Amino acid sequence: DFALPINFGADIEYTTGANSVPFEVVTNPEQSGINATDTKVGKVTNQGGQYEALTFLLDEAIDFSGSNKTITMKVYSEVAYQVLFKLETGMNGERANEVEVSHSGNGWEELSFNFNNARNSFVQGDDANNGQPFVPTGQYDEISIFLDFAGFTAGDFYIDDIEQN
């Protein structure tokens, strides 16, 4: 039931990782622009940790064996920063990989993470491969969303409609 596509507030039994930043499903406080029909959204509370992530353990792995390698997600920010969508190590040990895009800071933005242009996630002692291009082809059950990737911005942000296409 906690599988893509994720639209929060449908009595979703979400599962977060041990080190996840606070997350909770809240009535949409910005029923505005691109997300005006959404009545419930995900409230992400950054604490100002440099690489702090919202981490979900999915009931069903995302399958990247096909040509549908693009994850889209609505994100609300009034601050311009980088957003990272990260696949942690897959079900079969598939390499952790990520796409970094910009949020222009204009409230609700549809961000597009095309894993055709993914790179190897930082792993300690893997200098040769860290940040090298990579296209996932495997099954990934653990996803990590970084608001203000590599920055220290703290505060409440909103997230909804994580989908594969």
Ligand X SMILES: OC[C@H]1O[C@@H](O[C@@H]2[C@@H](O)[C@H](O[C@@H]3[C@@H](O)[C@H](O)O[C@H](CO)[C@H]3O)O[C@H](CO)[C@H]2O)[C@H](O)[C@@H](O)[C@@H]1O
The secondary structure of 86-107 as a DSSP string is EE-S-TT-PPPEEEEEEE-SSE
CB of 22 vs ligand X, minimal distance in Å: 13
Which one, 28 or 96, has the nearer CB to ligand X? 96
> Tokens 């993914």 map to which residue?
118
Which one, 74 or 86, has the nearer CB to ligand X? 86
Instruction: Return the H-helix or E-strand segment holding 145.
Output: strand 139-147
* Contact (CB, 8 A) for 77 and 105: yes
Cα–Cα distance measured from residue 77 to residue 5, given in angstroms and rounded to the nearest whole number:
21
CB of 79 vs ligand X, minimal distance in Å: 19
CB of 50 vs ligand X, minimal distance in Å: 8
Which one, 31 or 102, has the nearer CB to ligand X? 102
Respond yes or no on whether the N-terminal peptide bond of residue 5 is cis (omega within 30° of 0). yes
**What residues line the site for ligand X (CB under 6 A)?**
17, 19, 51-53, 55, 84, 86, 88, 98, 121-122, 144
> Tokens 């009931």 map to which residue?
59
CB of 140 vs ligand X, minimal distance in Å: 12
Which one, 17 or 155, has the nearer CB to ligand X? 17
